[PDB]
From Swiss-Prot, chains A, B:
PTM-bearing positions, type N6-acetyllysine: K131, K137, K191, K248
Cellular component, GO annotation: cytosol; membrane
Keywords: Acetylation, Cytoplasm, Glycolysis, NAD, Nucleotide-binding, Oxidoreductase
PTM-bearing positions, type N6-succinyllysine: K114, K123, K131, K191, K212, K216, K224, K248, K256, K260, K330
Any one Gene Ontology molecular-function term assigned to this protein's record: NAD binding
Name of the featured protein: Glyceraldehyde-3-phosphate dehydrogenase A
Amino acid sequence: TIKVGINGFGRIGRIVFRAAQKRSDIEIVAINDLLDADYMAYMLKYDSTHGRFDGTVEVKDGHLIVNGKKIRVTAERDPANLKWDEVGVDVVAEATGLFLTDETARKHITAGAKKVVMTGPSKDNTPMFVKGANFDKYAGQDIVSNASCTTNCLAPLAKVINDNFGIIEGLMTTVHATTATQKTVDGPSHKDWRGGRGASQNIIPSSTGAAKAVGKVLPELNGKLTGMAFRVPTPNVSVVDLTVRLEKAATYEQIKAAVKAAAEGEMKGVLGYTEDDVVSTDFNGEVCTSVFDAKAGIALNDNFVKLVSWYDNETGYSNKVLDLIAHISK
Amino acid sequence: TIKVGINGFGRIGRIVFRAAQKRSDIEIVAINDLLDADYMAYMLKYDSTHGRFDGTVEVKDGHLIVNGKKIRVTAERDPANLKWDEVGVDVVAEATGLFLTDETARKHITAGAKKVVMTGPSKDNTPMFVKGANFDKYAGQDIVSNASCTTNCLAPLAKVINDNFGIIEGLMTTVHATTATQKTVDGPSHKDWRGGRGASQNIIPSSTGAAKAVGKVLPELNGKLTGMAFRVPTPNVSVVDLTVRLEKAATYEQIKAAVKAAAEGEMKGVLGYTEDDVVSTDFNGEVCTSVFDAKAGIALNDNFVKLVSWYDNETGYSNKVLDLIAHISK
Ligand SMILES: NC(=O)c1ccc[n+]([C@@H]2O[C@H](COP(=O)([O-])OP(=O)(O)OC[C@H]3O[C@@H](n4cnc5c(N)ncnc54)[C@H](O)[C@@H]3O)[C@@H](O)[C@H]2O)c1
Ligand SMILES: NC(=O)c1ccc[n+]([C@@H]2O[C@H](COP(=O)([O-])OP(=O)(O)OC[C@H]3O[C@@H](n4cnc5c(N)ncnc54)[C@H](O)[C@@H]3O)[C@@H](O)[C@H]2O)c1
């Protein structure tokens, strides 16, 4: 199997670990953060969002013992000091959010790993890969990114709408749930003033280049999309609101048939389709990175439409990151 | 196999149905509320608090088919028009919060049912039974009550404490989750001015009879306890705060030992014991009606202490309701 090492036992680092348990190809051998193996264990055991860990976790000699398997624990602030090779790591999952450039994330390879997958969009030219978008373009690069959560939701959809009706232009808006970067009450966020204001108290307009990034994963769409976001008071799962102009006219019943078909075939396991009266909680724990909501979307006419799709920014993305690791190996 | 009908397909009505699916002695044969079989099916398929129904459900002829079995659907507002006997209903789970007196609840007997179990404390002399307190005092009555979610938490604990060191007097406080009786924004609640205030915006002081009621199911304690509640912005899982004076002096480590023993034996399944740094969400879906939080409790001296216990006001209570049903059914 593929020996995976995690750096940053955060929301993504933890959920990636949880979901990694229901996989036969990958296996977590080591974890790094800045905590004691007893706190790390408490963090894995209880989750306010996805409930109690489904298995056993014990602390022993400063390391974890999850499901009877020893997980090496470290608390090194610098990635270059991780000696991942002492534990046989193949690919490293960069979930800290501090190492999204090649020079930063490469410390993992010089530390003994083989490849690295950033759990966020790269900040330099490091290639981004999206399941159902361009996984087929991976060219053996040793450091890759899995784009963002919003992109993993918008790319698979735009792709289907473009392949059937051709997208002239599109403007996206994602209503996102709160994340670890926000504040409980109005506090400092000097890189983004709006993002520091009380999360649970407001609807916070926010920026995102997830729409622009779709043109980089699907070049055909390059430059045709852009958008923004609204951070709202929910602990998880968000939804994208894409308004596009189409080349080849089509009725909603027709747009519906297109998505459902992809959802049933090529985009199976990535793009989903539903006609139910769902709400955000119905997706807490969802593995499909994009679930089309037939009943929520709306069209002004056969060439101007607003489509809506759901994504559990935590589980969907975390599962795809693992897919990318399996993809780039061997 | 006990056949049961549910009156009021609400939060408790619905969780009871879900809990019953894992039991082989109980069988839900009919359901009544004030809605269509298709809305009923939606209410059951999707739950914001406990996830998507874990099984199959379909609508047919105007009734539902859940897990290969057919459930009769009615929308009768007057319980006496239910003809429970047409489907062979043994016991009915009164879950509307509207028929909590023998008079109103007896209509279910008039309608064909042989026994009734109100999911709320009786409004009259109707006998209340609480698992871990007075189940063994059931004397064949046809109409009983499972008390409240709060009394089902306090009674089991108050008994281990009484039996071990004797309780002279106690005052209780329950930090309770929001319920269907509350409102989204400041609205009319003619019978509880505070309860009508925006649930999500306030810490709402509320009165309880759960404390006194403990003396009714544990006569020894009669008159020695009383209390109040605080309604806070959470969707589920509450906790009781018991401050008591003890006859026999006991260290906190003595008290814990007693609880842990009753929990690991005599009260196993009703009262639980933990020493972890738990929070409310860690109990969403908990079956034990009272989980003692060792680490949260505080003692002023060997005769004056504050004890803490957690309870999923939805899942534990709904499970014990099925317990009482199984109990009175012999
Ligand atoms: N939150 C989401 O829903 C979501 C979805 C997709 C992608 N992402 C991306 O994934 C990354 C993970 O975000 P997250 O939500 O888990 O955040 P998080 O803050 O919950 O987790 C990050 C973890 O990094 C640890 N850490 C900090 N400095 C470290 C260091 N020097 N060495 C090792 N560990 C260190 C922190 O203690 C923390 O546990 C971010 O870059 C984010 O942009 C987040
Ligand atoms: N909410 C809790 O956590 C909790 C815990 C223990 C006990 N209880 C008790 O259980 C009862 C259930 O409360 P709940 O939270 O499920 O409330 P709820 O409002 O969610 O459920 C009540 C259901 O009754 C239906 N109903 C109304 N009038 C009816 C009629 N004439 N005939 C049939 N159905 C009718 C409503 O449409 C609704 O679905 C209450 O009496 C409450 O005191 C509630």
